[PDB]
Structure formats: C-alpha cells, structure tokens
Amino acid sequence: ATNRDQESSGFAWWAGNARLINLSGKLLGAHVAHAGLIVFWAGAMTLFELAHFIPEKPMYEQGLILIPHIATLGWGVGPGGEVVDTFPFFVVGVVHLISSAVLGFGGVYHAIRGPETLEEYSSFFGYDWKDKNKMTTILGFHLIVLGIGALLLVAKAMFFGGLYDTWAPGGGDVRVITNPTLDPRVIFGYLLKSPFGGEGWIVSVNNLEDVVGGHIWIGLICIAGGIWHILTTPFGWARRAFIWSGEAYLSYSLGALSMMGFIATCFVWFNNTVYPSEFYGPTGPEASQAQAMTFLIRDQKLGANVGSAQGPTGLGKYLMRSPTGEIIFGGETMRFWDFRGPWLEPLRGPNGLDLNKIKNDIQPWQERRAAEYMTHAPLGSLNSVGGVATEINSVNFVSPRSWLATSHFVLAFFFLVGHLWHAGRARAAAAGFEKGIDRESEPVLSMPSLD
Amino acid sequence: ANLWERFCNWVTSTDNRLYVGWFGVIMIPTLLAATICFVIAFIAAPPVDIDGIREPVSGSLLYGNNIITGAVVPSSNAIGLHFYPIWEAASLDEWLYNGGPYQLIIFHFLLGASCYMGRQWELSYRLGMRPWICVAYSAPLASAFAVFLIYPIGQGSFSDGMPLGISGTFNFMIVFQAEHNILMHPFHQLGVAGVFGGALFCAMHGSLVTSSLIRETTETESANYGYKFGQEEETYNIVAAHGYFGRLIFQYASFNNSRSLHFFLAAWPVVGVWFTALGISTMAFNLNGFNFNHSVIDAKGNVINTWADIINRANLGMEVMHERNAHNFPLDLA
Amino acid sequence: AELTPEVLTVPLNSEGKTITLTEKQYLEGKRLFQYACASCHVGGITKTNPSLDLRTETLALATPPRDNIEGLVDYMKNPTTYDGEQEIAEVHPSLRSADIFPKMRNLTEKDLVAIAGHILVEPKILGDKWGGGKVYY
Amino acid sequence: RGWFDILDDWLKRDRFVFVGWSGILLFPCAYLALGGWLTGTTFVTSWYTHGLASSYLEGCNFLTVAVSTPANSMGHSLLLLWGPEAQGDFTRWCQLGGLWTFIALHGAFGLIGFMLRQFEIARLVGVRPYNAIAFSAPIAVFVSVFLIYPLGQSSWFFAPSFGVAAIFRFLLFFQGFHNWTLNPFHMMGVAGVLGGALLCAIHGATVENTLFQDGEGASTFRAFNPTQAEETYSMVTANRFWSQIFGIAFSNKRWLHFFMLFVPVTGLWMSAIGVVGLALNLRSYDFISQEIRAAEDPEFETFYTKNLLLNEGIRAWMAPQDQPHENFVFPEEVLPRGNAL
Amino acid sequence: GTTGERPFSDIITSVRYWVIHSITIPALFIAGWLFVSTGLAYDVFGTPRPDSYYAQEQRSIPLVTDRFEAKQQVETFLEQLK
Amino acid sequence: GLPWYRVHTVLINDPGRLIAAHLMHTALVAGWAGSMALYELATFDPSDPV
Ligand code: CLA
Ligand code: CLA
Ligand code: CLA
Ligand code: CLA
Ligand code: CLA
Ligand SMILES: CC1=C(/C=C/C(C)=C/C=C/C(C)=C/C=C/C=C(C)/C=C/C=C(C)/C=C/C2=C(C)CCCC2(C)C)C(C)(C)CCC1
Ligand SMILES: CC1=C(/C=C/C(C)=C/C=C/C(C)=C/C=C/C=C(C)/C=C/C=C(C)/C=C/C2=C(C)CCCC2(C)C)C(C)(C)CCC1
Ligand SMILES: CC1=C(/C=C/C(C)=C/C=C/C(C)=C/C=C/C=C(C)/C=C/C=C(C)/C=C/C2=C(C)CCCC2(C)C)C(C)(C)CCC1
Ligand SMILES: [Cl-]
Ligand SMILES: [Cl-]
Ligand SMILES: [Fe+2]
C-alpha cells in the first residue's frame, strides 16, 4: 500500500488525488492522462460537429463551438464566411483524437507501471516542491513552449495562409497579415485601457494586425521569461513573499485560470473580431443595434423622415445623441452605441451615424445582415427554445456566445473558489495548523482579552 | 523596529478590538465611502433618470418615499456600462440626475466586500484557525456581484442592475422573471433548495441540541445559564439527540459525528447559493429558464396548456408593462 | 379532435381546385418551415415587419393572392411586396436568391409545397393564435 | 397486564422504523398523500377543472405535472369520494379534483401524525420536545396556505395546486393580485428563512474552522468520538474571530442553538399570519399617500408605482386562462401595454 | 447498535435475493408498461387521449360549472365527442 | 433570576394570587367593553339605518 489508502497517506478517498502530492512519477501520469482527455475531447467533439454540420446553415444555428475556431484561423472558409472545404476540420479532429491515444498510453503507463517517484531514476525530471531553483526551471521551460505556441499563431497569420478577417472589404474574407502592429504604444495601450464602457480593455482589439502583433510580443516576452527563470533563482523579497509548496503553486494557477476564464467570458460576449459573428452569431449588443437598423430601414422605406421622428419620450425614435453627442440608434439600444461591426460602420461619419448615408447608401446586404442578426440575438432557453423567455416553441436555437460565456463564467467562478480553498489551506499547512488548533498551546489563550 | 515595521505590526495586530489587516486597509475606506454616500442619497438624492428616457424616478425620503419605497436609483441607461465618476460630470447636479451615486456606492461596496472576505481569511491566519470561513462568505459575495455587476455587464447597462431599495429589489425580481423565466431555471430551484433547507437544517440543529441540553439549572433560571463560556465539556448529549433523531426517521439518516454534522450545515446552503448566484450570472448572458410554452399538443394540433403556459401569461403581463415608455421596437433584446 | 383530410384540404389555386395533403407532408412542412422560416415567421407573425402576417385572410388580399399553394410556391420562388409592385428576392429568401440565402439551396419543388401546405393548414388548427402574436400565446 | 398494555409494547418496540401509537395516524396518511400525488401526477388530468394537462400520461414533465385543484364550481366541498358530486365513481372523482382534497386532508392528518411522533419519541428517550415545537412552523404554513387561504376565497380552486410549475403560478398570482412582496409579514418570513440559511452556513463553517487537532491525519472527520466529553472545536477562538471580524460574537452555546431554532420557526409563523390576512384580500396592496400624490402629480414616479404597473399587467394577461370559470373576454384593445411590446 | 433485522448489505448481495428479484422487479415493470400500453390507464383515471380533448370543430374546454350536476356535465362532454 | 418570559410563573402554586390575577384580567376586559361602547356611542351616527 504505497499510500493508496487513508491510514498511510492521511487523506480519505474523497480527497485521494492528494495522496499524489509527493509521488512525482504517479503525478506525472495523472497530468499526462488528463492531458489525454483534453486532446481526446478536442478530437471527438470536432468530429461530432463535422458529422452534424450542414454547410448551408450558419454555424451558429447548429451548436458548433470548435469548428468556428478552425474557421477563424483561415481553414475551410472563403469570402463571407462561406464553407468551401470541410476536409481541414476533419484533419484537425482526427489528428487530436489519434494524438490522445499516445498521451493516454503514456499517462496510464506513468500512473501504474512506471516508477512511483522520479527522483531516484533521474535527477532532471525528479523534483521537490521546495526546490525554488528547479521549480522556476520547469516554469521557464513551460514559458518557452508557450511563447513558441503564440508564435505558431503568428506563423499562420503571416506565412501559412492568413486569418479570417470579418472586417475585410467586401463582407469578409481570409487574409494574409503582413504589417502586424509592433508599436508597443498600441500593443500595451490596450493593457491600459479602462475595462468600462466604450473602452473595454483588451476585449476591444478590433483588427487582426493588432492581434498578430500582440502575439509577437507575448511570444518573445514568454521566451525571455522562460530563459530568465531557467538561469535565475528567486530573489529575497520573492522568497519572503510566497508559500513554496505543491498546493500553493496549485492555488496560484487556479487564481490565474479563474482570471482568464472571466476574460474569455467577456471576449466571447462582446468581441466580434476574433469571434466573428458570421460563425458565432451576433453579439448581444449587435443584435440589439441590428433591430433598430431593421425598423429604421422599414419605416424609412414607407416615407418616414427618421432623423426628425420624435419618439414618445421626447427622444428620437430612430436616432438620438449619446451623452458625448455621437448620433446613435434610439430606444433601449442607446446603451449599445459602443457597438462596432462591419455591417454598420459604412454608415458611420465623424459625428456618428450619418443621415445622408442612412437616407441614401444602405445596401441590401446590410438590410440582410441586420435582419439576420436581429432574429438570431443571443437569447434563448436552456432547452434551446430560441427567443425571449415568453416566446413559444418553434426555433431550436441558443447562441454559441451564450453557451461559451455561461460555461466559462461558471468555471471561472468555481476556480476562484478553488483558489481561496487551496490558497488558505496552503498557508495553514505551511504554518502547521491545517488539521486544527492544538489544545496544548491554543494561541488565543495566550492573547490579552479584547475587553 | 522602525516606522514601517511598527505600522505593519499595528495593522496586523490581533489585539485591536476590530481586526484591521491589509485587506482592511482597503475595506475600511471603500465601505465608509459607500455607506456615507448611500445614507445621504437614500434620504436626499433628487430623482434619477434610470431608463435614459428623461423620466426621473424618485428614490429618496425627502422626495416623498418611505422606508419601503425608497432607493438609491441605478444610473441612466444612456450611460450603459460607461464609468461615471463625479469628475466626469459637468456638475453634481448632472451627476445626480443621471444616477452617479449608484456607481460610486456599488463599486466601493463590491471592493469593500471582497476585502471583507479577504479579511476573514487574514484573521483566521493570525489566529491559527482553519481558513475556509471566507469560502462560505463567498456565496453571498458572489450573489451580490451577480446582481450589481455581472447582470449589468451581460445586458450592457447598470440601469438593469438591482436597485438599492426594498421596492426596487422587487421591481428587479419581477422584470427578471419576465425576461429569463428564472422560476423555471434549475439553478434558482437549487437556490430555493439552498435556503429552504438551510432554514430547515438550522431549526433542526437548534431544536435538536436544545432538546438534549444537560440539566444544569433549576426551573426558574434560564437554561442558557448552564453553559459557561470556555467550558471544556459539551452542554448537551449528542448520543441522546442521535437517539431521538435516529428513531424519528431511522438510525442512519442521522449523524453521530459532530464534525460531519457541521460540515453538512456549512455545505448545504453555500452550495445552493453558489448555484443561484451562478444562475443569475448565466442568465446575465440570456441562457434562460426552461421554455415549455405550447410543449403539449393534441392529435389535431390544438395547444393543450400546462401550468407552464399559465406562468407565461403572467410573464407576458410583466413583459409588456415594464418600462412602458422605453421600447420603440418590438423585441426587448436586452 | 385529430388531423383529418378535411383539415389537410387546402386551395391549390385561386380558381378553387383544392388538393388534399397527408399527415406525412404536413409534418414535413412544419419541419421545413422551422428550418427555413420560423426565425422570422414563428407562429405566423413576421418579426422583422410585424404588419404582415401569414394569416389566410392576409394572404387573400395579397397581390397576387397567396391563400393557395401555387400562389405560395410562387412567392417562395419570386417574392413580391403586398401589392405586387416590387420584387424583394434581394431581402427575402427565395429560390431566386438562394445564393445569398443558403438554406434555400437544398430545397426542391416538393419541399416548397410542404411548406405552403403547412402555412395554409396551420390556421385551420390554431385559428387566431396563428398570426396573432403574444396576445394569443 | 391487559391487552392495551400488550399493544403498547409492540408499537413501541425498537425496530428499524419505529411505529408507535402515532404511526397509526402517520403512516397511512403520509403514504396516501404521497401515493395520491404520485398517482395524480403520473396519470390524472386537470382538463375538466382547469383546462390543463397535468400528468406524465399527457406529456407533462416533472416541472409541469401537478395534482391540480378542483373546479371553482365545487366551492369548498370536501369532495368525498362517496359524496354528492362523484357518487362513489372513482373515475369521475379524479376528473373533478378529488385527489386534491384527498392529498390536502390526508397530508394534514399525516402532519399531526409526524408532530405526535416527535412527542412520542421525545418522551420514550428522555429529551425535551423542542424538535416537536419547531415543527409547528411547517404545520402553520401548510395550514394557512393550503386550508385557510382557500376557505377565505371563493373555493379550493384558488388554493395551491401540488406541482412545481403550479406553485410558481401561485407565486406570481400572489404578486399580481395581492402584492404579497410588499407585505410586512412576508418580509419577516423572508428574513427568518434567509437568516436561518445564514445561521446554518455560518455555524457550520465556524465549527469546521475552529476544530481542535484530535487526530494526526488530514481528514479531520475521523477525529471525533460520539462518546467524548470534550467540545470538538474552540468556542473561545470562534468568539475571538467573530468579535474582531464582525464586532460581536456568540459566547453561550445554548443561546446560539436556541437562536437557530427561534429564527426560521418565527419567520415561517409570521408569514402564515400574512397569508391568513390574504384569505380575506386583507392585503398590504398600496400606500395611500403615494397614490394620492401620484394621482395628482404626473411627474411623480417611484419603484412602488412601477411595480403596480407590473401587477396590473399580470392580472389582465393571466386571468382569462387562469380563472377559466369566469369566461373573461378581453379584446386586444383593453389589454394594458407599454409602447411597442 | 442493531435492532435485529437482517443487514441490507447482506441481502442485496445474497444470491437468494437476486433469484427472487430478477423476476419480480422486471415483472412489475412489464405490468406498468402494460397498464399504459393497453390504454387501460386512460380509462381508469379519465384522462383524455390525444384525440379526445376537443371535438373536431370546437375550441372550448369542457369545464364543469355546477357542483351537483357536475358528474352529469362531464358525461355530456364525453358523448358530444363520438 | 426569572427570565422576563417566566415572570407570571410565580402564581402557579398560589391559588389566591391566581384568582387575583384572573379577576384583574376580568376587570380589564369588562373595562374595555365599557370603554369601547362609549367611544362608539360618542361617534355613531343614528340618522340613517338604510
Ligand atoms: C506563467 C508566468 C509566470 C509566472 C508564474 C512567473 C513567476 C515568477 N516570476 Mg517571472 N516572468 C514571466 C512569467 C512568469 N513568472 C515572464 C514571461 C517574464 C518575462 C517578462 C518574467 C520575468 C520575471 C522577472 C524579471 C522577475 C520574475 C520573478 C518571478 C517570481 C516572483 C513573482 C512575483 O512577485 O509576481 C508578481 C508579484 C508582484 C508583487 C510584483 C508586482 C505585481 C503588480 C501588483 C501587478 C502589475 C505589474 C505587471 C507585472 C505589469 C503591468 C500589468 C498591467 C498592464 C495590467 C515568480 C517565481 C521575480 C523573481 O523572483 O526573479 C527570478 C523577478 O524579479 N519574473
Ligand atoms: C482525471 C481523472 C483522474 C486521474 C487521471 C487520476 C489519476 C490517479 N489517481 Mg485519482 N481520483 C479521481 C480522478 C483521477 N485520478 C477521482 C474522480 C477520484 C474519486 C474517486 C479519485 C480518487 C483517487 C484515490 C482514492 C486514489 C487515486 C489515485 C490515483 C493514482 C493511481 C491510481 C491507481 O493506482 O489506480 C490503479 C487502478 C487500476 C489499475 C484500475 C484501472 C486503471 C486504468 C487507468 C483504467 C483505464 C484504462 C484506460 C482506458 C487506458 C487504456 C487505453 C490505452 C490506449 C492506453 C493516479 C495517478 C491513488 C493514489 O494517489 O495512489 C497513491 C489513490 O489511492 N485517485
Ligand atoms: C511532459 C510529458 C512527459 C514527461 C516530462 C516524461 C518524463 C519521463 N518519461 Mg514519459 N511519456 C510521456 C510523457 C512524458 N514523460 C508520454 C506522452 C509517453 C507516451 C508516448 C511516455 C512514455 C514513457 C515510457 C514508456 C517511459 C517514459 C519514461 C520517462 C522518463 C525518461 C525520459 C526519457 O525517455 O527521455 C527521452 C527523451 C527523448 C528521447 C526526447 C524525444 C522525446 C519526444 C520525441 C520529444 C518531442 C517533443 C514534442 C515536439 C513536443 C510537442 C508534443 C505535442 C504537443 C505534439 C522521464 C521521467 C521512461 C521511464 O520512466 O523509465 C522506466 C520510460 O520507459 N515515458
Ligand atoms: C388513520 C388513517 C386515516 C385517516 C385519518 C383518514 C382520514 C380521511 N380519509 Mg383516508 N383512508 C385510509 C386511512 C385514513 N383516512 C386508508 C387506510 C385508506 C385505504 C382504504 C383510505 C382511503 C380513503 C379514501 C378512498 C378516501 C379517504 C377519505 C378520508 C377523509 C374522510 C374520512 C371520513 O369521512 O370517514 C368517516 C368515518 C369515520 C370517522 C369512522 C368512525 C366510525 C365509528 C362508527 C365512529 C363512532 C364509534 C362509536 C360511536 C363508539 C366506539 C368506541 C369504542 C371505544 C368502543 C379523511 C381526510 C376521503 C377523502 O380523502 O376525501 C376527500 C376519501 O374519499 N380515505
Ligand atoms: C390563557 C392563555 C395563557 C395563559 C394564562 C398563559 C400563561 C403562561 N404562559 Mg403561555 N402562551 C399562550 C397563552 C397563555 N399562556 C399562547 C397563546 C402562547 C402562544 C403565543 C403562549 C406561549 C408561551 C411561551 C413561549 C411561554 C409561555 C409562558 C407562560 C407562563 C409565563 C407567561 C409570562 O411570564 O409571560 C410574561 C409576558 C410579558 C412580561 C409580556 C409579554 C408581552 C406580550 C407578548 C404582548 C402583550 C399582550 C397584549 C396586552 C395583548 C393581549 C393579548 C390578548 C388580547 C389575547 C404562564 C404560565 C412561558 C413559560 O413556559 O414559562 C415557564 C413561556 O416560555 N407561554
Ligand atoms: C490514470 C487513471 C485514470 C484515468 C485515466 C485516463 C484519463 C485515461 C485516458 C485515456 C486516453 C486519453 C486514451 C485515448 C484513447 C484513444 C483512442 C483509443 C483512439 C483511437 C482512435 C481511433 C481508433 C480512430 C479511429 C477513427 C478514425 C481514424 C477516423 C474516423 C473514424 C474513427 C474516429 C473511428 C482513472 C481516473 C480512470 C482511474 C485511476 C487511474
Ligand atoms: C496578445 C494580444 C495582445 C497583447 C497582450 C499583452 C501584451 C499582454 C500583457 C499582459 C500582462 C503583462 C499581464 C500582467 C500580469 C500581471 C498580474 C496578473 C500580476 C499579478 C500579481 C499578483 C497576483 C500579486 C500578488 C501579491 C501581492 C499584490 C502582494 C504581495 C503578495 C502577492 C505577491 C501574493 C493584445 C491585447 C494587444 C491584442 C490581442 C492579442
Ligand atoms: C391514490 C389512491 C389510492 C392509493 C394510491 C397509492 C398508495 C399509490 C402509491 C403510489 C406510489 C407508491 C407510487 C410511487 C411512484 C414512484 C415513482 C414514480 C418513482 C420515480 C422515481 C424516479 C424518477 C427517481 C429517479 C432519480 C432521479 C429522478 C434523480 C436522482 C436519481 C434517482 C435515481 C433517484 C387508493 C388505492 C387508496 C385509492 C384512493 C386513491
Ligand atoms: Cl419596470
Ligand atoms: Cl427599443
Ligand atoms: Fe452546533
């Protein structure tokens, strides 16, 4: 019984993976077998979607989350978002699913057959949570891999076919990026933008050039950090500031993933550049703006002067001013006037929406987009009735942006909880009271009374 | 010991009547600001144009509310999610009309309360305690984040945040039912299970320990005087309460490990309230409650109403009446 | 009540000749009307222009009239405004505009007749609910 | 040594499920309210009493099934199976709403059975009967809501029906017709229930996080002996923590557990009282001063007026289908609606 | 302690147990199935079949409106149906 | 000391003082009925029983 029971490890079955904290080989097996399940799921799910895909329905009408990520990368898609070749989705699927078997094979190998602990068999892979030099070394290696991985996305954009660019002229098309943005005033200007309305911090990045350039910077930054940590050991202030245990390292990463899940939730909900609406359905704001456009167009066609129609409240029924003066769509949509998308910007002049362009330059393709986007707003029920809560059954639809944002909020919230759990536990384990208060030296009893 | 170190020691002193802490260094100012702004606003703020349609809603006592109807009214829908600090307005008169106090209060309050959570961790570390009380508080904290931050983010406006009033809270619940059918959402059903059962188990535990209190007083004095603060022994007979309660149902429906029993009391409502906070957070992104409207139809295709269709009729009453001047187009999409 | 041939009998043309559908077709048209039309037309209203429903009496005062299967198959090939004075295949899916409205590519003349059957049968079943909107839900 | 005492012996034997004298009330009524609910939700319609389907057999799911209340035309009839209405005809009994009374009355006696069971077992074992006392609040609620409320109204129609979506209907009805959220007795009830869940959670967490170390392992549950005199956590450290965090802290464990009984039990009692008020339409519906000013001053709006606009919309949009026996016919044009919606 | 009955852990692992319940349980299942599939539950409980909520050309529900003639009401509707 | 909610228990084994309490209670109720009727006479309008 090498731990593997409660009496030797001190952990019950329901906390059994904690029996692995100091079994580096068996722990490696569990990480790689879990890596296994992720690559597996990337594989199985892509194939499912492909087997269920009807090229003549919008992706967002079909419950696809993974195929839209491959389409965003410039494979299988043409002008407008149209699917031209499904083979690359098939490939991406199978390659992951096949790969998952080798991960699983070697994860199961290491968890069972292999040496339970790596420290005798090899001084390079073995480790000790407390070895602050060896831990930064692994960090630095993993950093390097990630800087490489970010540079792979640059390779795709600059050398290996480009990226789906929703902003592209003529309604959107795959495009080679060749002048990425490297001016760090732009790239890090995003980090300093307010996260509030009309700014949006990095969720606001709205053009592939800024995207590519920020992955050049992240990739290089990550490579220098990799090297730095491989060659450095932590400084005195960092030594005094942290907890150096397996669980603490876990709690730090759970904190980081939480933060990341929250940002992804807002990326997928607001951003229509790296989550193009052609594949993911319109954003919440985008549908709500599109409704106002729709009835601007309808009513103008009947002979309404939409710039002077005074609505019931005294505000303009179709057009009003934002608080800084821009001309924007009226009604509740007034909150969404920060919205920006390729179907609407053509009517945008310097003061906002331009009445002359509205009166004269609305093309049928914009009328169509706006009717499509309005009738696919990201509202729906949990059993996939599409519409407001009060709608009758008929439309089987929930926006992929609802699915992706809801799921990743839930996960982010729960990983913040994981962070607090393992953070405080790591603190109290290191200080020696995670199993309770010692009756013989109860600290409070040595303290002066409060009153 | 120098200036910084004497201060550091005061801040983290476990001898202060109220623990301060590094978390408290943030919590104290942000809570004070929120509490002072809230109290002045509740009594005296002038009307606020919550829906951005130039139709102010009076929320303060001096303008003809009472305790039940008054509120700090949420900021204008014209503002959407834009940040509206005092210094961004042309005059306090503009900041008041547009509902600036709601932004100031909620931001300082959410910051203040996140550090309250943190301060619970901190003091438990100085006291040599186990750390996880702050995990329990995280259920109500998230719940508050859901109504004051997340739901505004998903809908694009703090105008659809929860109002800081008794009647405003009801307004918010009603509009939510209409737009998301929250009663029909499983996560809110989990939260009802959270709080009914937390109240259920809270009576059960009180009633059961109280039942098995060991005689230590006479008939005239309060039984409470049979516990002494700090006593080593337990004041009640848990064997006896298991003996009562095992028989009331059956032997294994009943706890006999005090530790297992109290973790259950902690876990039940905290989990339930996590789920309802998550339900609010996810309906923030319009993933709504089950929709069984016209789900049952007969051989010919007439609709056979269930109780769900009856809910939907009430929902529709809420839908068409709420914010009656604010919609110019036929779908209410946020 | 049940689904009968008297209910599944609908005008084939405006001269009076009817045709009598079958369970299998009516369900096909409901399934295809979902796939193709429910996004804007759920329940017989029209979300992107509420003034224009699929009520049988509205399709009657259409020009050309539309309360029969041929009239509807024709709308779905080459749609017009209510008065007939304009073609709107540019902003209304039809076979004509199947390049810009992909869902219309894989449809066949029998599919379009399923969809019209549905539309003309459905108010026989639900009455005022069809084309009424939320008052009738 | 008579037959009464022999029967007492056997009813009070230590077995897996204690029977007692109260079992003779408890088990029959509890089993029948239960099985009646199961039977109605699985098999029985509400088509003739409500215009609704309500069973699995009709295609309802677990949220939308219900044993629905009897038609309004039945008034407050006991709806006995052998009574004037169904005349011993079981099938017509189900179609008329008999299972609603069947479950309401049997379960009301089942609850008596359970409280008497609490007294019986409290007594044989030797404990103060505080669990029985606490169960008064559930009985108070059952009675006020399922029995008293509809006796005050036109009929059992307006009681709650036993189903998940049916109860939700009840909630919204109370909002739209009684403005029950504004009622101070519901506010106290809400405070007692939310406050009890809070006390549940905070006491649970506090004890788990002031435990003493009593074993040498990381699972702390195995370090408690049901037969130990020692308190298993530190009242003293708990008290310090809360005094410094929150300003006050419990210091008396008896008081603390009485408080846990008192708070939720009292909340439920208070809400019972409000519902007995609503049996009579004795509602806290309005604030007169607000309505007087609002009537005269078009520019005066509060959250209170907004909510009555919402109540007015619930009543008009849900009544025709919810109270079908009234044959309400509302043309489109009299339906209250805001712009566009 | 133990009140005296056989431990559940011991019964559901006994073979005798499964010998008995590998019949009884499935049998009770088939009977329930048969209860609905024969259409016999519709008849016992008075639940409409999909084809008998409404008559062919009516959209009004058969609500009972009198307390004592109520059984007589319900039977009237069932015949205005054949 | 007696808790406030137990103070009337000093009459349990005191039959004379329980009568005394019970008489005071009776005096309070008759006192109330006489009081109520007078307030109602002083505000009742008899001019129109229709
Ligand atoms: C997975 C990513 C990762 C992780 C976990 C670490 C972890 C660590 N690093 Mg490395 N690092 C990384 C990537 C990473 N690094 C990369 C990519 C680079 C290249 C830039 C470096 C460069 C680097 C340097 C130069 C140093 C470290 C140090 C450290 C240690 C102390 C960390 C510390 O104090 O945190 C942060 C905590 C703080 C208290 C610092 C202030 C943080 C403020 C409050 C946040 C805002 C500042 C932010 C960095 C920049 C602006 C962001 C804003 C726009 C939003 C720790 C072992 C230190 C060390 O011990 O030396 C070996 C050190 O001096 N790292
Ligand atoms: C992602 C999920 C995950 C992963 C990867 C692991 C991995 C691991 N766990 Mg944990 N654990 C998990 C979930 C997981 N656990 C959950 C959900 C629970 C709750 C019950 C536990 C409870 C738990 C306890 C109580 C213990 C572990 C232990 C272990 C380790 C040894 C297990 C062992 O000896 O089994 C031996 C088991 C077998 C020989 C049975 C079959 C095992 C294989 C892997 C079956 C699957 C075959 C698969 C199809 C691969 C073949 C495909 C081929 C192509 C390669 C191992 C590293 C043990 C440990 O830490 O030891 C020190 C231990 O005592 N775990
Ligand atoms: C991060 C993952 C990881 C890590 C750190 C280790 C570490 C270790 N393994 Mg394990 N192993 C892994 C994954 C991992 N393994 C996987 C996935 C498999 C299945 C394919 C195995 C199967 C396995 C067996 C069967 C054995 C080991 C053994 C060993 C030890 C000997 C080192 C060795 O063979 O060097 C050799 C290293 C090289 C020859 C370098 C080339 C290796 C590949 C080709 C590098 C390619 C990198 C790639 C480009 C990165 C992208 C990957 C992916 C994203 C596509 C060492 C403790 C041995 C052991 O424990 O002895 C008893 C042993 O016999 N491993
Ligand atoms: C303790 C168990 C119990 C209790 C309290 C009830 C209570 C009730 N049942 Mg349920 N019922 C039970 C068991 C029980 N039932 C069982 C086991 C079954 C399955 C067979 C049923 C089946 C059933 C049906 C089918 C129905 C009820 C109904 C009723 C209601 C009316 C009862 C009535 O009028 O009886 C009146 C009869 C009596 C009160 C019996 C008294 C008899 C004697 C003559 C009294 C006088 C004695 C004499 C003068 C002196 C003798 C003294 C002695 C010491 C010598 C009531 C809610 C009805 C209901 O729910 O409708 C809404 C209904 O339809 N019950
Ligand atoms: C005939 C009715 C009656 C009588 C004679 C008693 C008598 C008694 N009760 Mg019981 N009791 C009753 C009804 C009655 N109770 C009812 C209806 C309830 C439920 C609400 C209770 C619940 C109850 C509890 C929980 C307890 C008692 C206790 C006691 C004893 C102490 C009472 C005391 O000191 O209060 C002193 C009271 C005060 C100093 C002030 C209380 C202020 C009250 C709440 C408001 C003022 C009332 C106001 C004048 C309106 C009058 C109402 C009238 C119109 C009905 C005493 C033997 C106590 C006991 O068991 O002692 C061992 C105890 O713990 N009673
Ligand atoms: C350790 C452990 C564990 C875990 C486990 C794991 C996690 C594993 C995984 C595993 C893995 C991760 C594996 C994998 C596998 C895979 C596979 C085996 C694959 C294969 C493939 C193929 C065969 C393919 C085919 C195809 C193609 C090619 C095309 C089309 C068709 C198809 C798709 C069919 C547990 C917890 C239980 C317990 C304890 C221990
Ligand atoms: C890619 C991209 C981009 C870019 C990006 C970048 C450039 C980034 C950056 C980022 C960054 C650069 C980040 C940062 C980070 C930081 C943080 C996150 C930190 C944290 C810290 C901590 C957590 C701390 C803590 C503490 C304290 C405070 C005290 C003492 C103790 C301790 C230490 C614990 C863009 C947008 C253009 C576009 C798209 C793409
Ligand atoms: C009414 C009546 C009666 C009686 C009756 C009875 C007594 C019945 C019973 C009944 C019963 C006795 C039934 C039962 C039922 C059952 C069922 C229906 C169940 C189901 C369940 C389930 C569905 C579950 C499942 C689950 C879930 C859902 C979740 C979690 C998991 C589990 C697995 C638990 C008589 C003859 C006197 C006559 C008069 C009338
Ligand atoms: Cl409202
Ligand atoms: Cl609008
Ligand atoms: Fe306790």
Side-chain angles (χ1 to χ4, degrees), chain F residues 4-9:
Chain F
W4 68 268
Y5 48 93
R6 285 187 193 162
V7 284
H8 290 170
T9 67

Side-chain angles (χ1 to χ4, degrees), chain B residues 244 246-250, chain D residues 16-20 22-23 26-27 111-123 132:
Chain B
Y244 167 84
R247 292 189 169 71
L248 171 55
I249 310 287
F250 54 73
Chain D
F16 190 87
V17 151
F18 177 95
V19 177
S22 34
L26 170 59
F27 298 115
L111 291 165
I112 290 156
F114 197 89
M115 201 171 189
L116 285 170
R117 173 176 190 94
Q118 301 168 289
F119 280 119
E120 191 165 8
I121 291 164
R123 181 75 270 201

Side-chain angles (χ1 to χ4, degrees), chain A residues 22 148 296 351 441:
Chain A
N22 292 310
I148 278 167
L296 191 147
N351 286 32
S441 73

Side-chain angles (χ1 to χ4, degrees), chain B residues 234-288:
Chain B
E234 269 287 8
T235 30
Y236 79 101
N237 189 318
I238 209 211
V239 192
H242 181 44
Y244 167 84
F245 186 66
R247 292 189 169 71
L248 171 55
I249 310 287
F250 54 73
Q251 188 183 352
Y252 299 109
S254 176
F255 283 96
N256 56 308
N257 184 327
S258 202
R259 312 202 151 188
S260 303
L261 187 269
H262 285 92
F263 162 73
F264 179 87
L265 308 173
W268 182 275
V270 162
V271 172
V273 183
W274 280 338
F275 279 120
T276 201
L278 262 357
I280 293 297
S281 292
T282 54
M283 293 176 265
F285 311 114
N286 303 327
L287 180 55
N288 296 338

